[PDB]
Symmetry: D2
Subunit: 319 residues, 4 copies
């Protein structure tokens, strides 16, 4: 009994007696992701190089996501990392949902062919007045659904909702996402730390001490392994499946961290918590932060509960 994402979404829709609007939203998202996936794998690239004689992924992915979501008649406010201001869906195509997304995460890894993906956060419009940019300023805790598509060796879509986290593998032969890991839970403690040690000179005392323990454990256990793909979707997904910890904290030349709150942090923090993990800035929990700006940045620490807890305790140490 094989489960396609389409069938899974539909069943979650009926079990919740939804009017069918969100179900359509998720089906469109899934369709947009397959269209980005094919573009990422370079299908039809030969024609680009004039195979029959006589654009950028970031822009194409964004266009695909915008149009597909508008055509779902399920959204009223869209927030993209590629648009300075929130997109207000045309009245005739409005739904009750607000979507925040990262059309193509890992830009610096684009040209070297390293893994990249798509991240999204789905919110229910919490008011009655006209759709505006503020409708997307809800804290992650309010998320109805969040997830991501990872374009690695294989394309995978991870979806998280109140019920839990599920991983679906894309079978490109039939354009179908197959459920291959149901109700996933991150392990209590991992053995991998992921962070750009390049900004070592700018790390606060906590991170600096935490890193040190990983390489030189006081209790003399085995040192953690290091892994940094350079793309949030990839590092995070490896975290969810192998366990461990992922980090992108602030630093002298980037006080509020680099990663954006609405379409990168919240989405991943939500997937992590629903998988039995933690996601913190170092002091407060990502999902509880009250967004003040659509493109606001936020420090983020996530992964296995024990590894994250160990770090939270070091922060208190330097409280």
């Amino acid at each position: 009994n094989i489960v396609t994402l389409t069938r899974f979404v539909m069943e979650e829709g009926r079990k919740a007696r939804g009017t069918g609007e969100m179900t359509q939203l998720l089906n469109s998202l899934c369709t947009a992701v397959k269209a980005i996936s094919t573009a990422v794998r370079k299908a039809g690239i030969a024609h680009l190089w004039g195979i029959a004689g006589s654009k950028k992924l970031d822009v194409l992915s964004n266009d695909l996501v915008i149009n597909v979501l508008k055509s779902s008649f399920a959204t009223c406010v869209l927030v993209s990392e590629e648009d300075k201001n929130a997109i207000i869906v045309e009245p005739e195509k409005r739904g009750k949902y607000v979507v925040c997304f990262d059309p193509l995460d890992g830009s610096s890894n684009i040209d070297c062919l390293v893994s990249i993906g798509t991240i999204f956060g789905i919110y229910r419009k919490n008011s009655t007045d006209e759709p505006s940019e503020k409708d997307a300023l809800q804290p992650g805790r309010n998320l109805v659904a969040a997830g991501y598509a990872l374009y690695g060796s294989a394309t995978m879509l991870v979806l998280a909702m109140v019920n839990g986290v599920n991983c679906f593998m894309l079978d490109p032969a039939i354009g179908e996402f197959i459920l291959v890991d149901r109700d996933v839970k991150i392990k209590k403690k991992g053995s991998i730390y992921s962070i750009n040690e390049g900004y070592a000179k700018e790390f606060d005392p906590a991170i600096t001490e935490y890193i040190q323990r990983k390489k030189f454990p006081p209790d003399n256990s085995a040192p953690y392994g290091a892994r940094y793909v350079g793309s949030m979707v990839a590092d995070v997904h490896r975290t969810l499946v192998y366990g461990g910890i992922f980090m992108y904290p602030a630093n002298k030349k980037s006080p509020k961290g680099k990663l954006r709150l609405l379409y990168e942090c919240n989405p991943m923090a939500y997937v992590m918590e629903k998988a039995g993990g933690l996601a913190t800035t170092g002091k407060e929990a990502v999902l509880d932060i009250v967004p003040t700006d659509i493109h606001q940045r936020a420090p983020i620490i996530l992964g296995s509960p024990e590894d994250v807890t160990e770090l939270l305790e070091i922060y208190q140490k330097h409280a």
Copy 2:
């Protein structure tokens, strides 16, 4: 003028006036690569979860290459990371070439969907004696062709020969590798350092010093960025295209480093040198090491010349 990998090798073969054996071998290598990519991308995976009522990638990739290479009738001896002993092709199928290959590099990244690939080195038989492992124990400097296939966001095959390095992007729609980067040359100096710092406790003084210098630059320049995918093929490719340095030096468990010389170090060292870069163990040149064990290991530091020489100088400073 669109140029496919097929046309490219066929043309080189003619310029060189080869009898066609090496050309058929590179063509077979090309076919094997497309077959692995399709598998890695999970095509047909739906039949796995019985979409119609009802073999790991490592063994499959290995079996594909073996079968495809034997069937080329251009090889006599084969060395695989998956076989304890060298493989001697049956007489009826013997050619003059010796191939050393890493069917699926990046085993630890297989399940988390991170980039993986295939590495290969080709040598001509150097004796009239009956084929045996000896024929595979030549120094990298004798390679006639080397390269790899990266199965990342998209699939790319990098090929190097006496003339230079060329990158071919795979257009999966038509099953052709399109030439997208001619006679590639690495930047003299990069700004990215790649290594697993989890072995900090086991690094020697030079490596330690180099890494610190990358984080706290003496001339107070901006520190280098850190990147470590975990798959040699992925980190090495980013090094070739973006510039910088890649390192896997000796440690406790691996006093002579981890990576294998015949099918990992040499192929990447040949590619790196043909692109104007360097590849060293820290003491000598990778391509000049005469192996004595087909599964011999060797330390390796490679990438932009200026970055490598700087580390090389650290080594001789301590000596």
Copy 3:
């Protein structure tokens, strides 16, 4: 504003306030069709011929259709051309729907690579007693939905329901059926007659006279063109889109015609009528015949209303 079949099905489902059971049924059908389509195009055939060293489409298609439909939890009785008796779905997976289908039409065209397809008829269980083979013995007039997938130069899925007929093209790059012809209507009169003139010696007086008119028009107009692919799905689809007439009447050595009533005739008769066409046996209308046997055969004449009417009048001529 592009419409995928998935979105179309969902919207037709909400507009009709359906519980969502039929919607799932149609999504599964659509998924099964893409899985048959990939198998028909021979994807992965290289592995069959041992590409990595060391079944029939009719059977595979049937398995795919059976399993996918059972997993929809939307059917109670299935009727396949490949099974002597109706399939009674397991109690735990029962839905209210009855499906009759031709998993792979055009068997004789299979080995010569000519177009083949899948035909289906969806019925609502019209009683209360236990699901039995009789639940599938309803006359086509009772059809809730009917259509077919044509695996020609390109794969297309034609779907007909009370509302009308729509054609969706399959974009294999993203495994998505795209609406390309909405509310299709066959033209009043065509200029192509399709029939196997091989059984000329066995045709009744009506057909014999009708054929003659096509070649030698009494009014001296231009003779009709002849076309006979040899596969019902192909000939019929060309009929729906180009107009004209398709015929498979009885004959001395096949008194009740060849084509089967439940999964070939009814489905196509329904698609035709909803497209403004006609489908007759020569006397009565296909959709009104009361099925007596699950694999009962029936003569069929279909296509443009004028061309079919012309033939019905010749029958009355020899009444």
Copy 4:
């Protein structure tokens, strides 16, 4: 032993000791074919209906072949059914071969999704004079290679040369044509007749008599089955693999038949003869007709020897 079309032509080239020019030409033909197939199958069609916010197959197929053949550097003159005049390749790209091709055969079947294909004939230049149309006006008997690509339920490329006929099935997953039928030989006698009977009023006495004999067999055998896809490539392929006869004789509009000699009749006549079959105008052998017009038409009857000779005898009986 899996054999791809690439390996096959490369091997033949070696056995023949060619300089590699014809091999690169057949390799280019192979690439062009895969590019057309992908297009015919409608891959990427979603971008047409603006799935991301926003050229007929005949012109595209034509442009692909032209560009791909010119870029092979193996041709000097090209004849296409889509160009009024022969094409003379620029000096810098000139080879010794002359190619006559039918980029997309079966134009009337394009929109109804029925099987279509590409037909090609290859000749070596027969003079030292400057390239011109003359070089393309040689009798079929001079072909060095001919064949076609059928885009039916699956894509297949049939290739014929002095040695014989071989069929290669395209595995779209890896973009390779796999040898699935070696040294093909047509049945001495078939049981299928293919022709458009709509021109009955215009057929000559022999054709008329033959067709009647096929329906009412004198020896009272079972009548032949009728089949006419409407695309020469499709009907001819079924004739080669199942046996039987294919016909397109003269009529009012086309007194010298319809099908073109250079890129339709000859290629199929060469293939049919190399497979032990016959191809005649009814009076002489197709391959021996010396053309005088690149777009010259010719009557053609081809298929199983016994079936063709029987019709040939009808012709001489009347004469």
